[PDB]
């Protein structure tokens, strides 16, 4: 009755039937499937290393099989950029990662701008170039004590000339000689012709916008197939035939999981409906699909005389067959339009004063 | 209205032109006109005779 | 029900949808009436005797 | 050590209908008892693929430098695995990186280095009498790889180098695509027995891997194996046979496909939404 | 001959057998455009509220709100002028009854 | 023409637009209600005998 | 032409929004118009007859 | 094509237009770039969309046959997607694909401006 | 050699140039670039006025 209340925006109700929200369930608990995995990802092997790469020949690497718990660089490490693409910081440890590579080089300190979606420049250009629609993270931190030595530090080296720009995550290892003019190069340096590569110079006093910088770029996708990597959560048991919020890889909801007969490829984790919504996931533990189903389900109707009359009611449950009910007493009747509780069933006939539906009528009488 | 016609800034001028380039057609009816005349003469050589 | 048709299960959604709520009422006002229309549609048919 | 082949016949180019072929799933998400419209590159229905084979003891060798323009579907019947992998680039030899994918009747070698191609690549089988045993013998593709940024090499194995006699067995399809630094394979082997030309049905090929090479590919070629024995008496560049084997390759475009799933999760039908009104 | 011909051929109720179509495609429609990214990231708030937070998640969610809220509204546009025309059939049918 | 209205010769907003196809079928099917209603209309009128 | 592929779907959504609700808005009113088209076919065929 | 920076898609044909010095494009109505001065030479094109025209199909049942009719209203008969045997010129548009007959029946599909089209033997 | 101070800055009329802005890839180094109402990456095909 108070939904109608609100529902009208009055303190008031007219005789007659209304139709209220659907029968809602509430989840009894919280359900979090993720991937039994236990070693801890290489964080030492990728942001603690000896030597990294140049920008030009750039290294990717494989992450695989491994807890995220990125806390345990808080001790170590301090990065200068943090930027993540199609997902938000905050929301990391809930999530299980995809194809997690890991993308490290070092430039200088007044090109770390240059890697992000949709930039231009000498390293977006012609070394190494982000896609559009990049998802991942990109990191970076001076290195100015352990990669710029007294008397120039000339190791890491850069593509200056290209013919032209690179592809997203394309790298180019080539030294041919760039003609720069019309008059060929015959493979030797000269007028017009240039090597193609250059060094950085990184002597410890140069400024903060020349002085060494290590980048680490993170890819991966989110919820659409298995995964290996995933965010520190602490996994529960299963339950089924109950509505409960789960999390499955990163995969967030509400629904009752019941026992599927579908058959997933081994390279499926999700299924989806027409909707697109996910009605099907093979759990991560134990190999099982389940499926997916909403709590909510049902219309409900309220008939009320005036609430000028009389604050009773009685409600109508269709898609119930008397239970998935607010509350039952006295007075359950089963009609063809759903079931009716609150209200008396008598066996004589009137003239419609409420009408219930399928032939069924009700009306506030003594 | 064939292509032909509408090439050149005859496009922005004439208006059928301007809705062909835009996705709009207008479809012509299934009876033509004759045969709409038919039917009426028929209707009047029944009522009369 | 706007409510399970816009937002699903989620509360956040439904806590975003509460701004549209007068869309929502005037939708099934509309539908309500249409629905009581068959009613009477049927009665106008059938019931003259 | 990377010699060239001769006593090859010339023939003029073949060509062979595409009859809905090259479908591949789109995506790994599962659906059943739906149709799903997707958009991606794929080979358009009744297209005009080309022939390659190797066949008469020598005839025919075909193994040359095609385009890969944005993606190729390859397909090829063979009962004696002929066809032992390809190689992409964009100029083949030690100055750009190329991948290499091949099966050396041992392992799958997969390789991003910097190649120095032959002309005429190729491996070998030698068939031995008094043993009636066939045996690999040769690894004529490359002279010589230096700057390598990739490789993967997989479990041992020892696959049969017999030459069968008798009608293709074997149907093997590969759609390979090059975007955002990764090569994307989709793989189906389909049983079939047939004497000449692509057998006319559907299949959907399945995700196989999704290799980060992060290189330019326009170009590729082919990695055939030949016979040799005591009934080719010539030298290293006359004297081989060839055996028995064709591949068809066709190439992709943005296509829009309705796809058909079935009450399993299985693609059964497709519709080329551009083929025709 | 009427009962006949009802009795032997299979779609002489045209026009009732098109009110039932009508109605459960403009539901099966309806169904079908939850699909819609409407310009969001997904067309599934449990994606968007799964990878996002609480901030960056209501630009997506209002999108998707705004999109499935117009598709109530031509659902329900065109359920009135449907329920016009029936309206005058039925005024017909209540005159011919008459 | 959806397309043709909405996108014009433009590929990037063809490829945008394929998430609202279902709208556009929706607008054709409303169209083509109306255009072979036009024709029952001119038959009932003109075509009683 | 001014924005790359990230930047012009901003506004290319908006573009195709706006378009989307004219054919929409359009095809509305024409149904609108069809009804009492339909109902003026109808008396002209009970005036025939 | 590319004028100044302004790409786009179009037939470019010789214009009538007469641009003040300083104008260098013209618009139309819905505000697309319809004339163009071109800055090597000084003259004024005309930009004209590429697509074109309506398009119908006539089907029987695909469950019956697989062929089809293909209408091209605002042709007369080219830009057809295919042409061959059967060329009909209708006043609703160029009929490919249907085999013109001199008898009348009733009508099975309705193809416009008093033409009809049906499967028969 | 000499830039101005910021109250009284300098203005400069640039035309009848290419900007082929790599040029400054070998020599220069800039901690902030920033477009508005254009993208980096097309600057390369569009003529400024
Ligand atoms: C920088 C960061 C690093 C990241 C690393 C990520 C990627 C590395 C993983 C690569 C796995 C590749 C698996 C696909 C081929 C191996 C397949 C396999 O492990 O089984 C071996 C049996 O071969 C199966 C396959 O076909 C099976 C039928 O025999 C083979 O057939 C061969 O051609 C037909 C001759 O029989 C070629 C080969 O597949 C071609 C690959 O496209
Ligand atoms: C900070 C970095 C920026 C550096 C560069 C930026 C841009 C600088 C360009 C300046 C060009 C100004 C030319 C326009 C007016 C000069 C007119 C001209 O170049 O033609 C001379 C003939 O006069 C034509 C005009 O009128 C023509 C009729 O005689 C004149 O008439 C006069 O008044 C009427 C008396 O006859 C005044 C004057 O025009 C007034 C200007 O508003
Ligand atoms: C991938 O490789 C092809 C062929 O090597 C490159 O295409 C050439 O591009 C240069 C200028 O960059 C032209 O001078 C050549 O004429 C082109 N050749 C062909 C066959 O088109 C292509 O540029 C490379 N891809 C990238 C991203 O650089
Ligand atoms: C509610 O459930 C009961 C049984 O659970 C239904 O009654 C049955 O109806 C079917 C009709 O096909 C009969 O075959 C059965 O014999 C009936 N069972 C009993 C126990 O009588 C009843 O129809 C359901 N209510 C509604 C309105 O759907
Ligand atoms: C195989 O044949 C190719 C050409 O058909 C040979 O490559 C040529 O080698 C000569 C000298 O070594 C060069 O002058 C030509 O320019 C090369 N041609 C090409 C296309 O590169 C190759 O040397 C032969 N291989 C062997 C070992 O016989
Ligand atoms: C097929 O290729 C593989 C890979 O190159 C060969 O196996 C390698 O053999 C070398 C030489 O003994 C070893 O150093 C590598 O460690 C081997 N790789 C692995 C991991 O297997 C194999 O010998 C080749 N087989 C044939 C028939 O040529
Ligand atoms: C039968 O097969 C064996 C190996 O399976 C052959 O033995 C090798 O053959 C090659 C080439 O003939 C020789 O270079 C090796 O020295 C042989 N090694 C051994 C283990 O003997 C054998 O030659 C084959 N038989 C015949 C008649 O060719
Ligand atoms: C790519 O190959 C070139 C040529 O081998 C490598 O350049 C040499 O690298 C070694 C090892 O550092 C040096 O000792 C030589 O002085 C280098 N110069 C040459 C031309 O021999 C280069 O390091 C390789 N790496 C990449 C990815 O570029
Ligand atoms: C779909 O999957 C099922 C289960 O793997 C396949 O098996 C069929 O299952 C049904 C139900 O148990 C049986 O009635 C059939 O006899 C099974 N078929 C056989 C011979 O395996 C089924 O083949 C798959 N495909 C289709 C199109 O149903
Ligand atoms: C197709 O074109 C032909 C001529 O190209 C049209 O036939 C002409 O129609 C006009 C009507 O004003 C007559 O004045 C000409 O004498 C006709 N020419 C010939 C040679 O027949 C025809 O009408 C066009 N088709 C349609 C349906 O528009
Ligand atoms: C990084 O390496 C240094 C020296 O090897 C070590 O002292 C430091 O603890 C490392 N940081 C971590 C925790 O990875
Ligand atoms: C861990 O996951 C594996 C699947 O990789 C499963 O076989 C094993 O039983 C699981 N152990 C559990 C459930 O603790
Ligand atoms: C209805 O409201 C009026 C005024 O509030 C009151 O006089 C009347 O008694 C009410 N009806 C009943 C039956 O209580
Ligand atoms: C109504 O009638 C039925 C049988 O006629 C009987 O079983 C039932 O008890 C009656 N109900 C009431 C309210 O008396
Ligand atoms: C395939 O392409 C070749 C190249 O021109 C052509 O000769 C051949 O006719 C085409 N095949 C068919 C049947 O279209
Ligand atoms: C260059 O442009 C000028 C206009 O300023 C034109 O007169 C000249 O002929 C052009 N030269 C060409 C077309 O190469
Ligand atoms: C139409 O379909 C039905 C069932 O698929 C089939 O029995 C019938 O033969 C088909 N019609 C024709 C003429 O082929
Ligand atoms: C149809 O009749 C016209 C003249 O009325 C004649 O020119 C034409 O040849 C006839 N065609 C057939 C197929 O009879």
Known sequence: LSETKCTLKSFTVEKGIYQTSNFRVQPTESIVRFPNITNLCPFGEVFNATRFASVYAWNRKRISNCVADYSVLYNSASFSTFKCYGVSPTKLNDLCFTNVYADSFVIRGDEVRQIAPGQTGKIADYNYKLPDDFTGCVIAWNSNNLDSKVGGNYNYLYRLFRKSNLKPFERDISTEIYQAGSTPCNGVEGFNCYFPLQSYGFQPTNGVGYQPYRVVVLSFELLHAPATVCGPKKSTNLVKNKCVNFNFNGLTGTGVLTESNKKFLPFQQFGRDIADTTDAVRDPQTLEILDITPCSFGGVSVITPGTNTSNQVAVLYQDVNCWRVYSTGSNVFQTRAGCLIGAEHVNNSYECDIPIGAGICASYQT | KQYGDCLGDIAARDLICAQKFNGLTVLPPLLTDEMIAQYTSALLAGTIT | DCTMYICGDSTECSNLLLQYGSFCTQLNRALTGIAVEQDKNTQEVFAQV | QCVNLTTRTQLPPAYTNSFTRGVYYPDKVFRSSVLHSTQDLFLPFFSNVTWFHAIHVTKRFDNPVLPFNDGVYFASTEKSNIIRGWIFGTTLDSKTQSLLIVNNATNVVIKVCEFQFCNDPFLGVYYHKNNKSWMESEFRVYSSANNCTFEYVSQPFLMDLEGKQGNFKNLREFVFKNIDGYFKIYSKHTPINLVRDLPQGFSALEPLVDLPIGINITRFQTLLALHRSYLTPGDSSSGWTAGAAAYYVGYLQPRTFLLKYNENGTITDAVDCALDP | ?98
């Open chain 5, 1 to 98: 001959k009427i009962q006949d011909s009802l009795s032997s051929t299979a779609s002489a109720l045209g026009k009732l057998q098109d009110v039932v179509n009508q109605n459960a495609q403009a539901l099966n429609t309806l169904v079908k455009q939850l699909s819609s990214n409407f310009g969001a990231i997904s067309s599934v708030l449990n994606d968007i509220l799964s990878r996002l937070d609480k901030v960056e998640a209501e630009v997506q969610i209002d999108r998707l709100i705004t999109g499935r809220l117009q598709s109530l509204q031509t659902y329900v546009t065109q359920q009135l002028i449907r329920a016009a025309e029936i309206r005058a059939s039925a005024n017909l049918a209540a005159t011919k009854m008459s």
